[PDB]
Amino acid sequence: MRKEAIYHRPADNFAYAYDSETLHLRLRTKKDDIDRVELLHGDPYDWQNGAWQFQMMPMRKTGSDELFDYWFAEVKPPYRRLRYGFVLYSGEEKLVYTEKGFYFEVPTDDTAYYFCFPFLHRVDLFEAPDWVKDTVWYQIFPERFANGNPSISPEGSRPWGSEDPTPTSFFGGDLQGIIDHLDYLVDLGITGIYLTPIFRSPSNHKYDTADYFEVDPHFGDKETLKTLIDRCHEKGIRVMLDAVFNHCGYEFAPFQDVWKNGESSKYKDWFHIHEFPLQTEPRPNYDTFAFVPQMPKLNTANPEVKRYLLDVATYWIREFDIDGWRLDVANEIDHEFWREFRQEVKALKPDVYILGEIWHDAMPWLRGDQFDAVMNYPFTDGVLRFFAKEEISARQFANQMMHVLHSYPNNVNEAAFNLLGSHDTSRILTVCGGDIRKVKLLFLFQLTFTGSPCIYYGDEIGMTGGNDPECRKCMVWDPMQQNKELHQHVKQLIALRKQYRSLRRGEISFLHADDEMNYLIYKKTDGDETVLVIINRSDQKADIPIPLDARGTWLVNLLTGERFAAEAETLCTSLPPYGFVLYAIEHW
Amino acid sequence: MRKEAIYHRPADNFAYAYDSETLHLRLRTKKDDIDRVELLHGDPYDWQNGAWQFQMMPMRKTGSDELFDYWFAEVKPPYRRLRYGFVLYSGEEKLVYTEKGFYFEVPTDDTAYYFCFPFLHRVDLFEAPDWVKDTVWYQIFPERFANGNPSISPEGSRPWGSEDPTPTSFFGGDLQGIIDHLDYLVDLGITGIYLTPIFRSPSNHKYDTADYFEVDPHFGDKETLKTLIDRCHEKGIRVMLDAVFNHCGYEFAPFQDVWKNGESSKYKDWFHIHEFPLQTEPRPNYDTFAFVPQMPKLNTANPEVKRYLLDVATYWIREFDIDGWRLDVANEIDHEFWREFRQEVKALKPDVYILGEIWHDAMPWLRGDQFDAVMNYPFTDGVLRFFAKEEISARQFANQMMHVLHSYPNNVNEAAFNLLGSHDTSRILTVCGGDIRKVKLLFLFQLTFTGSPCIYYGDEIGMTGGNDPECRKCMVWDPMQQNKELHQHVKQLIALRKQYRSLRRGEISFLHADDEMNYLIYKKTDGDETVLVIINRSDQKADIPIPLDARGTWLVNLLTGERFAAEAETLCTSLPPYGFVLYAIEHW
Ligand SMILES: [Ca+2]
Ligand SMILES: [Ca+2]
Ligand SMILES: [Cl-]
Secondary structure, three states: OOHHHOEOOOOOOOEEEOOOOOEEEEEEEEOOOOOEEEEEEEOOOOEEOOEEOOEEEEOEEEEEOOOEEEEEEEEOOOOOOEEEEEEEEEOOEEEEEEOOEEEOOOOOOOOOOOEEEOOOOHHHOOOOOHHHHHOOEEEEOHHHOOOOOHHHOOOOOOOOOOOOOOOOOOOOOOHHHHHHOHHHHHHHOOOEEEEOOOEEOOOOOOOOOOEEEEEOOOOOOHHHHHHHHHHHHHOOOEEEEEEOOOEOOOOOHHHHHHHHHHHHOOOHHHEOEOOOOOOOOOOOOEOEOOOOOOOEEEOOOOHHHHHHHHHHHHHHHHHHOOOEEEEOOHHHOOHHHHHHHHHHHHHHOOOOEEEEOOOOOOHHHOOOOOOOEEEOHHHHHHHHHHHHOOOOOHHHHHHHHHHHHHOOOHHHHHOOEOEOOOOOOOOHHHHOOOOHHHHHHHHHHHHOOOOOOEEEOOHHHOOOOOOOOHHHOOOOOOOOOOOHHHHHHHHHHHHHHHHOHHHHHOEEEEEOOOOOOOEEEEEEEOOOOEEEEEEEOOOOOEEEEOOOOOOOEEEEEOOOOOEEEOOOOOOEEEEOOOOEEEEEEEEO | OOHHHOEOOOOOOOEEEEEOOEEEEEEEEEOOOOOEEEEEEEOOOHHHHOOOOOEEEEOEEEEEOOOEEEEEEEEOOOOOOEEEEEEEEOOOOEEEEEOOEEEOOOOOOOOOOOEEEOOOOOOOOOOOOHHHHHOOEEEEOHHHOOOOOHHHOOOOOOOOOOOOOOOOOOOOOOHHHHHHOHHHHHHHOOOEEEEOOOEEOOOOOOOOOOEEEEEOOOOOOHHHHHHHHHHHHHOOOEEEEEEOOOEOOOOOHHHHHHHHHHHHOOOHHHEOEOOOOOOOOOOOOEOEOOOOOOOEEEOOOOHHHHHHHHHHHHHHHHHHOOOEEEEOOHHHOOHHHHHHHHHHHHHHOOOOEEEEOOOOOOHHHOOOOOOOEEEOHHHHHHHHHHHHOOOOOHHHHHHHHHHHHHOOOHHHHOOOEOEOOOOOOOOHHHHOOOOHHHHHHHHHHHHOOOOOOEEEOOHHHOOOOOOOOHHHOOOOOOHHHOOHHHHHHHHHHHHHHHHOHHHHHOEEEEEOOOOOOOEEEEEEEEOOEEEEEEEEOOOOOEEEEEOOOOOOEEEEEOOOOOEEEOOOOOEEEEEOOOOEEEEEEEEO
């Protein structure tokens, strides 16, 4: 066995409380290097006859990435205290992996050798709002969804969908237009809406905020926003707004004061200023979002700033009853602020979903004291590389999915915001080079994956476009221009997801087929039901062997409803080019 | 390249801010497997400025443990933001290590593959009080230091130091006794005193608290405590008290109420009770420290309990100006409480040192939002196994020290509470089998090691005893029963530590000798200042070669003060059994 590939450390994704009485422990080792692994565990103070009392529990291999095998075990400490280790077996070789290193047999003269999970506290438990787990989100960029009130449209607004958008063009989309098209979303099966910024700002995207306490006049007023939220609630749709707390806009009052009065302004500490007076040339002498002068970075360490943003955060919840806050550039704002943010938000309305925009590994923000989840862009990356660009094999895709999922605790993955694109990415149909068959596969995977998926407006009807701003075209309402095949496909999958719990909250496992290149086979299971998905990611028909025992095993096609029994101990599934099939499994 | 042994993840000991402008990045690889490592780095938004290529910085190997090599690099992001990857060079091939995996060359496209350190926030920076770095602590168990007030000694106190202590014996030690012997401590060189529990409790150790707002009558009164602290402060000695917040005592009023009234008690939720009425056996029906009935666990999640404990924490600081809080069984209290604890204590007195009693890996409590340090028992175990028990080689000792040190960020190690024993361990002289020569080596290593070391009362004069209660004998004040040589050795070493910054704040590196079984050679470095230490851990004379080069190099024997020029390529030093020598290395 290779000791250099064995790893565990008491925190993050390797050791965490799943609930008030249960702990989850993981261990990773070199793939196929270990035959069996057992968790050695016991209460730190449980002694009898002068010997430490501990037991052995076999661990299950939950999956593996390109380099490692991941092992899992759940344990309910008798007194909520635990000292543990790992015993690995390979042939006649045995290793005991502990915090103090490796041993060849279990040392029991003391507990100091072992890893420790001191005490399971309910207060430190990671707990996201349960309702998001069954939710399917729909992201809307307000300036481009629907012009429901022409009288408030920006002057210079272009005819709807008359031309591709630019960084400064306006088409007159507003909040009323969203209200007017809610039945379209209900029919689709959407139960959650995520809106990009809607507070006063001069731009079409509004990430350069002028006033966080005012709805942009071009989008509507507070009365209209309230009606929108109330109407969504009546129809069973939760609403999440965009919080741009990392930076403000050039027209933000406090910034204007500092821009004019420099170091004597009482708002100078509200920002990250390097020298006075402020300037934008040759470059800004203050921190900004990226290198954008009109987006001054806010000092969230300043008491007055924190008070203001926390007031903003609770105001919209208290007065408008929103259901979530999507945090713009969340990773660039300090942890101290995010902890206070959670405390005040959750104290007001525990149901509010706290979603951070972080495109990379976000474990530091997912320990339970800050966010409920992050926009899962790493998932986006992997799914697009396999289904859209076909850059990696099915084997490599499974490895990447196993890699990212095992990088986090199970309860964290259960609340993950799994998207395929957004206002900050190219359109999936375009990433797919215009092949609807590939887009159908993207939706199939997304909608059968555990978590809280989000659909970018227009992707369900085949809208096209490159990256920002090309991906922000006016929503296509003309039924003659909407791709009917895709819309029906999405509606169908969302319905299925709502009907099968394993798709929404189950564990995922990948089965290795003969052709580990184009055939993807995976299962979703929650202990009560099991759904098998088989995908032929190739332009040729395929006969794919399904690795499952045929003893008393019955399958039910979820799309056609057809029931049939297996027998060949490995039934053969025949699929047309880019075809796919889903089966509910029955063991009688 | 063994990909399975390579590792980095943007947090804890692998990625952190060292100061407001500097980031530290670490990478671990299979020992001797990698020849060189380069850090590819840049600002995440460099692309906006047309800067698509990374900057490159070579990483330095800071040490190796049993299985890995550790690489290091410090970076000052121009805009406090960083995106990075690693380039590893091996005879086999060159590989780029990123968050998305390994690549043979730096990806030429614009996809996000890299690790990220979003923003360097001063507010999230780990920062312990600077003064602790130059402090040498002395731990005192009040019931056994000195009987300065016979009139308040417990009834039935045994003649001072006349017999071995027991779990229930009393000798009459008190706070006045400490005051009476301050000059002894000043002479020794001590600049910090850590006292075990001193609040009212029926026991001789007092970890079963009866009243947190009262100094035990047998130890003295609030007036005596003030005198002690003021005299200490006048002598440049800081004072740290023991906070027993995980559990209270059997005589704690709130608990007595619950034990009497049961479920009808208004204090029922102040503890962890499973059933009523409360029972103490076979095992308590309520959570306790270990299974001690007289030590019921407090519910630090209960608002009243938190307020009471926080009031306690701030009371002694505000009223008596203490300089630190040592947290008893700190790992068994929730993180939420520790965050509030830090906020309140630091707001009151930023200089207060927060030390948690955690014997295992404490990374989760050392990210900057909770403790400043923990009692470094893992250091204690490693040092004892080498110098005292001689159960491991000099090579294995070097590996273990590198292992535990690289497990934490540099600024965390710089404030670490490095002890060799305490009231919860056997006496070091006894662990050394009565060999004073070995104890001298223990003090030598401890006092030349970076951090905030602590000396257990009596160890500086050779007191003996097994583990609790044996290690709690009355302090020996008669010089005829004190080991003068050892005492002067400790006094001399504390003097040197104060004179050479590299000993208390420098980096450490182990130089591997030919006979790396008994010969230990290491150096402390801080800028150009270097202290070389050579230890002969064997019971026979030895001639050990000093690897150092003579290139305009001069050595200063820190024990004798003797100066001399370096011979040729390697100077040889003759040492007696368990001998040692320290040399300041000057580069001219
Ligand atoms: Ca309009
Ligand atoms: Ca006394
Ligand atoms: Cl309405």
